[PDB]
Design a protein around this ligand. Structure first.
Ligand code: MG
Ligand code: ZN
Ligand code: ZN
Lengths: 44, 56, 257, 65, 151, 293, 76, 94
């Protein structure tokens, strides 16, 4: 389970067991989006 | 009877290996010294027991 | 010991100091860069970064923003700097260019001195949120804690006798660049309050007719800041460190004996 | 790659005086007088205004986390 | 030590490897240290020696006209390792200020009984060397003050 | 320190932005299909399974087996947790292999000397039917010692040391130089184009217009040294310079200009390695070849 | 085959028998300094903690190597 | 600022001074020079990457005064000289 966002914007939260497509665009390629947690980078 | 450079680097090498395997040391103590450096100080005072053989 | 203030401007000053010597001048100069403390952002916590730039690059620019440092509330001549922490937050969303003026400060006396600094450009729907923590530091540890600059030069006089062909060319040249010229019937004296490039015709006369004599003990100082400390409060604070610094020495010396 | 907010040798801010600089050089005015009219004195401040790329427009539009 | 390795510093690669057993370690220290290899077996002449700045700096120290002041003598004798006490003496030209010559700062590094004389690359007038040589060969030990300031 | 092709870069000039360069890699873990019908699924590895790399290296994976981005992956940390299928339950029967019957852990992990933070995780399907995930991890890489610089004339070299801004030989203006080049290399390698370009940066920074410098028809030699002579400086670059340790005019006139350098990727973190006792050859019991093995 | 296994510019007289690959080494780049003596060398502190000598505690370095094993393999 | 003595003899003192740098050391050096009883004053920083905060000082006198007294009186002067200059600055921006 996830909430993956594909190329050319759209959201498509499904799974990973059978097939990986975008219904709206018709493409098949996905980036995993960044979470909303807090990390700490120093400024040097 | 001066030693060469090949015999002086073997007498130190054999004495530094005895000084690690037992072989109680002469007055060489202070405070921490690697066993190779103990052989250099004993050789400086000229109290090495090991002598060479001169084949002739 | 005496001073002559040539000009006072916003964030700059130039003056002439007399009655001192060569060792003292470097000690005053070096102390201003490496001892005077200022505030600077030291670490930033990111919540999200949809911008076109890397996390480190946005974090790097935040550290380079000059922040106002109120000298009437801590101690600037201490050897051990105070650790009081100021929180700088931001929560913006594009589209539009992000400026330094949008940063919020938890303490109204520490804000960016210059409000027209671009940080990052944001496209449609991209969000940027972070919290910046500022602390006191010195320039010797990291360049971000620099209060400004100091530059110094000797004070010299160029004597040009009237027997030198085309001496009038130096008179017009020196007056164009703002150097004072004192004229007499024997020769002229140019006070070099700034660099004086000798024109090519006169190279062969440097030493025979044209000679330069250094005035012992007089120096021209140039100081420029960025708005973190009030331009003529720099030298006063630096002087009070030298005093404090060379007083600790006496305590340690007596303890040894 | 947006303009550097300091110089690299002379510590002095510059990024506030770049977008005011470039909108007055695409009218035909000579840059020798534009940079002098602002507060740029040396030539260590000036080699990093006069040569820069500001390529942030191309990279931004691609849109990927 | 960078004519033995034949290296320069434009990003080269040097590899070290530690020896471990106590017999193989005292052979490395006695037979292979740097100071045993200061001259070379191909032509006798020294190999580990001075390079680019060490030569052209040494010409600026011994030029006729190299007068260092008092602060510059005292600062450089602390920087070049050596330990001497308060004897930079005797302030040879007090005409402007009490300041030394360039020869006597170089004449603290040599042992106390050298005697060498030879001719080097800068000789553009062989006649004014001759005169100096002629006196030397007949009067083996002249006085260092009088005649030798014809140098 | 700058003898025999080295160079001495400023400290505060590094620490404000000179040559801060980034480094990327990428990894291409996939999901194959054997001809028997058993397909290897990727998940979080359990403690039991044969061939465990270790424990507490899996603190960054999510449930399905993908690193959520922007995490400081370092050392030998894993990237994607892969379970492989049994692979011959009945071939050996070496006195205990009949009962265990489990799986043999295989995966992908960053190369064991690097560091950095992840950037973007891809997930897709390739041509036949399978699935493959691509992960890319970046790096920050401040320019310390070793990092080879060069001109475009051929004066290559390495950072000598990293001297602070305060101890810099500086000039009778607001100028504090960055790269103090060794003077013993210009009248030995015959690179006079270095010295024409160094004045041409100083003229074309004060005037305002970038000097044309093409071959055979470019800006001539004499017109630069007159435009420098009428803008307020001496005709040959030379200027009065003060040392930063003690502070007195160096009794010479030190040359100074603007030269375009460029950083090169023979950086020191891709060269330095040490080997105490590693994995050896099976046939000879001798070490392997390359850092990738 | 055998004659190509015996020979061939990397066989098993020069390639693997009289010339072998070693242990306890390092390899990096170089950079000058005229402040150390003529017979010294710099060693980076990462390479210094990944190469080791054996020491064989006898009687007079026993106070030293008690501290070297009490300190862990982290502090130098 | 902890003084680490190294050599101590008759009319001579050598020591390390942690935490200081070129800035104070150079000012302290020539200020010492003004004192006629100090025959020899100098300093060195050894290899400024591994250590650049502990200059090695050397002070030699003619026997008529102790080396500590020389240091003592020479760090008086700098405090007094700064105290002067400071007053000048203040009473000039008016
Ligand atoms: Mg090479
Ligand atoms: Zn889609
Ligand atoms: Zn600049």
């Amino acid at each position: 389970y996830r909430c993956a966002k594909c190329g050319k914007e759209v959201e498509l939260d499904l799974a990973t067991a059978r097939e990986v497509r975008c219904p709206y665009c018709g493409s098949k390629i996905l980036y995993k989006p960044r979470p909303r947690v807090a990390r700490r980078v120093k400024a040097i | 009877f001066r030693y060469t450079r090949f015999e002086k680097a073997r007498i130190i090498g054999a004495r530094a290996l005895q000084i690690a395997m037992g072989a109680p040391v002469l007055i060489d103590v202070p405070e921490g010294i690697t066993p190779l450096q103990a052989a250099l100080l004993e050789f400086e005072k000229g109290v090495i027991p090991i002598t060479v053989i001169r084949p002739s | 010991v005496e001073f002559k203030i040539l000009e006072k401007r916003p964030d700059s000053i130039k003056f002439i100091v007399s009655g001192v010597d060569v060792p003292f001048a470097n000690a005053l100069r070096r102390t201003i860069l490496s001892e005077v403390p200022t505030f600077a952002v030291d670490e930033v916590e990111f919540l999200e970064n949809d911008s076109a730039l890397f996390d480190e690059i946005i974090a790097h620019r935040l550290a380079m923003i000059p922040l106002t440092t109120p000298h009437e509330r801590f101690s600037l001549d201490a050897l051990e700097l105070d650790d009081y922490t100021v929180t700088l937050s931001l929560e913006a969303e594009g589209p539009g260019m992000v400026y330094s003026g949008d940063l919020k400060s938890s303490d109204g006396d520490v804000k960016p001195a210059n409000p027209n600094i671009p940080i990052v450009k944001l496209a449609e729907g991209q969000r940027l949120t972070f919290n910046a923590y500022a602390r006191l530091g010195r320039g010797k540890d990291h360049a971000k804690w620099q209060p400004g600059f100091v530059y110094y030069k000797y004070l010299t006089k160029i004597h040009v006798s009237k027997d030198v062909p085309d001496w009038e060319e130096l008179k017009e040249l020196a007056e164009r660049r703002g150097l004072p010229v004192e004229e007499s019937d024997e020769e002229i004296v140019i006070t070099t309050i700034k660099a004086f490039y000798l024109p090519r015709k006169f190279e062969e006369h440097m030493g025979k007719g044209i000679r330069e004599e250094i005035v012992p003990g007089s120096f021209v100082f140039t100081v420029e800041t960025n708005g973190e400390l009030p331009v003529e409060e720099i030298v006063s604070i630096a002087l009070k460190i030298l005093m404090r610094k060379s007083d600790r020495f006496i305590n340690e010396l007596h303890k040894l004996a | 790659m947006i303009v550097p907010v300091r110089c690299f040798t002379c510590g002095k801010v510059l990024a506030d005086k770049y977008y005011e600089f470039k909108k007055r050089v695409e009218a035909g005015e000579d840059p020798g007088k534009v940079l002098d009219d602002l507060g740029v004195e040396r030539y260590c401040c000036r080699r990093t205004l006069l040569s820069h790329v500001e390529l942030i427009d191309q990279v931004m539009v691609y849109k990927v986390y | 030590v960078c004519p033995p390795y034949n290296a320069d510093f434009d990003g080269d690669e040097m590899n070290l490897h530690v020896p471990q057993t106590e017999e193989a370690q005292a052979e490395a220290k006695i037979l292979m240290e740097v100071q045993n290899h200061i001259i070379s077996p191909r032509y006798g002449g020294p190999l580990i020696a001075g390079i680019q700045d060490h030569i052209s700096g040494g010409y600026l120290l011994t030029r006729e006209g190299a007068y260092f002041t008092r602060y510059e003598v005292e600062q450089m004798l602390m920087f070049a390792g050596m330990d001497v006490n308060e004897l930079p003496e005797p302030d040879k030209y007090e005409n402007g200020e009490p300041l030394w010559s360039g020869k006597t700062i170089f004449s603290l590094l040599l042992p106390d009984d050298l005697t060498i004389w030879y001719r080097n690359k800068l000789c553009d007038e062989p006649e004014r060397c001759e005169a100096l040589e002629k006196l030397i060969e007949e009067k083996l030990i002249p006085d260092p003050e009088e005649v030798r300031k014809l140098a | 320190y700058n003898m025999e092709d080295a160079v001495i870069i400023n400290k505060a000039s590094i620490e404000r932005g000179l040559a801060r360069s980034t480094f990327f890699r990428t990894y291409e873990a996939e999901e194959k299909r054997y001809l028997g019908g058993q397909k290897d699924n990727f998940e979080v590895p359990s403690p039991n399974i044969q061939g465990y790399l270790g424990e507490k290296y899996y603190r960054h994976l999510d449930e399905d087996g993908l690193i959520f981005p922007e995490s400081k992956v370092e050392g030998k940390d894993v990237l994607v947790g892969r379970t492989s299928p049994p692979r011959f339950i009945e071939e050996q029967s070496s006195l205990g292999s009949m009962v265990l019957q489990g799986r043999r852990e295989t995966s992908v992990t960053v190369r064991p000397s690097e560091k950095g933070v992840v950037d973007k995780v891809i997930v897709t399907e390739t041509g036949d039917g399978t699935k493959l995930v691509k992960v890319t991890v970046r790096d920050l890489r401040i320019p310390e010692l070793g990092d080879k610089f060069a001109s475009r004339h051929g004066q290559k070299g390495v950072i000598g040391l990293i001297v602070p801004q305060e101890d810099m030989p500086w000039t009778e203006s607001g100028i504090v130089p960055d790269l103090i080049v060794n003077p013993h290399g210009i009248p030995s390698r015959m690179t006079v184009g270095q010295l024409i370009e160094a004045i041409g940066g100083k003229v074309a920074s004060l005037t305002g217009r970038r000097v044309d410098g093409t071959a055979f028809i470019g800006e001539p030699e004499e017109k630069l040294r007159k435009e420098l002579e009428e803008l307020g400086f001496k005709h040959s670059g030379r200027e009065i310079m003060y040392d930063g340790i003690t502070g007195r005019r160096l009794e010479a006139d030190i040359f100074i200009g603007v030269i375009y350098y460029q950083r090169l990727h023979h950086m020191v973190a891709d060269k330095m390695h040490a080997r105490s006792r590693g994995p050896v050859q099976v046939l000879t019991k001798q070490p392997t070849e390359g850092r990738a093995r | 085959t055998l004659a190509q296994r015996l020979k061939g510019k990397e066989g098993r007289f020069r390639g693997n028998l009289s010339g072998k690959r070693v242990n306890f080494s390092a390899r990096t780049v170089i950079s000058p300094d005229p402040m150390i003596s003529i017979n010294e060398v710099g060693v980076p502190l990462a390479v210094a903690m990944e190469l080791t000598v054996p020491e064989k505690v006898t009687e007079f370095n026993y106070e030293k190597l008690k501290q070297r094993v009490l300190n862990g393999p982290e502090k130098y | 600022m902890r003084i680490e003595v190294i050599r101590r003899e008759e009319n001579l003192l050598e020591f390390y001074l942690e935490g200081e740098d070129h800035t104070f050391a150079n000012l302290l050096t020539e200020t010492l020079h003004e004192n006629e009883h100090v025959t020899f004053a100098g300093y060195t920083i050894e290899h400024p990457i591994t250590m650049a905060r502990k200059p090695r000082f050397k002070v030699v006198t003619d026997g008529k005064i102790t080396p500590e007294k020389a240091l003592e009186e020479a760090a008086q002067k700098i405090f007094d000289r700064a105290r002067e200059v400071l007053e000048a600055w203040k009473a000039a921006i008016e």
